[PDB]
Amino acid sequence: EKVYQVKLKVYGPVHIGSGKIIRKQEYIYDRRKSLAHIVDGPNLVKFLNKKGK
RNA sequence: ACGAGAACAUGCGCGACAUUCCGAAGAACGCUGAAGCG
């Protein structure tokens, strides 16, 4: 059995899904900075509970 | 005034000794998190 090393050169963006979709409520979108902060829900909820927010 | 009268078919003695229910054996074969775009 022969073996080879596959080199996938990405000429177009590739999205292998994970079965999980989030909405703009779940994560952060700084439009002016144009950056999306992916956050985890439990930490945000506990932070808001600590801050009373 | 019975071929009769007594007279335990009895005594000591382990169904016991040696033994692997093991030997061989892939829970794996195929399987794009993807299709349409409203």
UniProtKB/Swiss-Prot annotation:
Superkingdom of the organism of origin: Bacteria
Protein name: CRISPR system Cms protein Csm5
Role played: CRISPR (clustered regularly interspaced short palindromic repeat) is an adaptive immune system that provides protection against mobile genetic elements (viruses, transposable elements and conjugative plasmids). CRISPR clusters contain spacers, sequences complementary to antecedent mobile elements, and target invading nucleic acids. CRISPR clusters are transcribed and processed into CRISPR RNA (crRNA).
Additional record remark: Encoded in a type III-A CRISPR locus.
UniProt source species: Enterococcus italicus (strain DSM 15952 / CCUG 50447 / LMG 22039 / TP 1.5)
Full-protein residues shown: 3 to 55 of 349
Similarity-based family: Belongs to the CRISPR-associated Csm5 family.
Self-association and partners: Part of the Csm effector complex that includes Cas10, Csm2, Csm3, Csm4 and Csm5.
